[PDB]
Write a protein that binds this ligand. Structure first.
Ligand SMILES: *[C@@H](F)C(=O)N1CCC[C@@H]1C(=O)Nc1cc2c(Nc3ccc(F)c(Cl)c3)ncnc2cc1OCCCN1CCOCC1
Length: 292
């Protein structure tokens, strides 16, 4: 058990300025924003999460405790906090949002190259969380954020219940493990391969435990060769050590992403194209990942 040497950064409310609401949900309000620090001549695009009961402040700072301890190119990092009346969290801006709404609203351009890279990247992030002995407990396509369409990161592990993503031993005994995240990674891939479909759609979350104990699982997407679906199926096995480890999910999908059309059959997948750093895409603005 090594000493967590993460630096926690305190920001002034006047160094950054909000710009627009990204989502006034139940938790509170998330804003697109710009952060202009000190006299550094840089503007970092950020997101800002604000919610003053003392029950909440302890939680928003425990979440911030975790998100300050991670550093990986496929996991979202905390940039800092702001100590106003309620605590504000300042994270890197992922301009394209959750992957779940990105695959729904762009399915007509998602070729097999992206789907398999995303599968690699998510696995790389989860394998980092394995090295950091960190169990996500809520991997899903909504908890993946799209910086660029070829760069996604895992978020929302402030809980380190959504039954349909949960492993079997997570529903009957609330046993959560790295090898239970593999199952949620499986449902997450299933989400990507069905371009945003709802798992076990229509079924009440009650019967999901029976369904799985008999031996039923999620369907095989059309675009999915048996090579891919075999992976998703191995994630959903009863015995947990029989499921793949994330460093294997990395290796497998890496093979498949070399010949993407051999494993995902998408009609039109050859001239699809997604927005990517080419002439358009993007005054003194720098990305957070290059500001250290
Ligand atoms: C899907 F689950 C989802 O999140 N959706 C669906 C559309 C909007 C909303 C979304 O993407 N919001 C969003 C959040 C962030 C975050 N979130 C965050 C979590 C925790 C925390 F502590 C902080 Cl400080 C912030 N961080 C970074 N960037 C974003 C960007 C987001 O939305 C991107 C822009 C909207 N998007 C979707 C609609 O059409 C245009 C693009």
């Amino acid at each position: 058990h090594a000493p967590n040497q993460a630096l926690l950064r305190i920001l002034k409310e006047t160094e950054f300025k909000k710009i627009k609401v990204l989502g006034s949900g139940a938790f509170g309000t998330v804003y697109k924003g710009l952060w202009i620090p000190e006299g550094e001549k840089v503007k970092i695009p950020v997101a800002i999460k604000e919610l003053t009961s003392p029950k909440a402040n302890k939680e928003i700072l425990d979440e911030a405790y975790v998100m300050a301890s991670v550093d990986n190119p496929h996991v979202c990092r905390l940039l800092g906090i702001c100590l106003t009346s309620t605590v504000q969290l300042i994270m890197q801006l992922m301009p394209f949002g959750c992957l779940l709404d990105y695959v729904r609203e762009h399915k007509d351009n998602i070729g097999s190259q992206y789907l398999l890279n995303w599968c690699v990247q998510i696995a790389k992030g989860m394998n980092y969380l394995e090295d950091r002995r960190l169990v996500h407990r809520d991997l899903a396509a909504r908890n993946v954020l799209v910086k660029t369409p070829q760069h996604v990161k895992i978020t929302d592990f402030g809980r380190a219940v959504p039954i349909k993503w949960m492993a079997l031993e997570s529903i009957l005994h609330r046993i959560y493990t790295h090898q239970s995240d593999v199952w949620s990674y499986g449902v997450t891939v299933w989400e990507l391969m069905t371009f945003g479909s709802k798992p076990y759609d229509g079924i009440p979350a009650s019967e999901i435990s029976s369904i799985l104990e008999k031996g039923e699982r999620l369907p095989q997407p059309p675009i999915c060769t048996i090579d891919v679906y075999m992976i998703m199926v191995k994630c959903w096995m009863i015995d947990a050590d029989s499921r793949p480890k994330f460093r294997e999910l990395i290796i497998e999908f890496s093979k498949m992403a070399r010949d993407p059309q051999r494993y995902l059959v998408i009609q039109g997948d050859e001239r699809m194209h997604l927005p990517s750093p080419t002439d358009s895409n993007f005054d003194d603005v720098v990305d957070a990942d290059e500001y250290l």
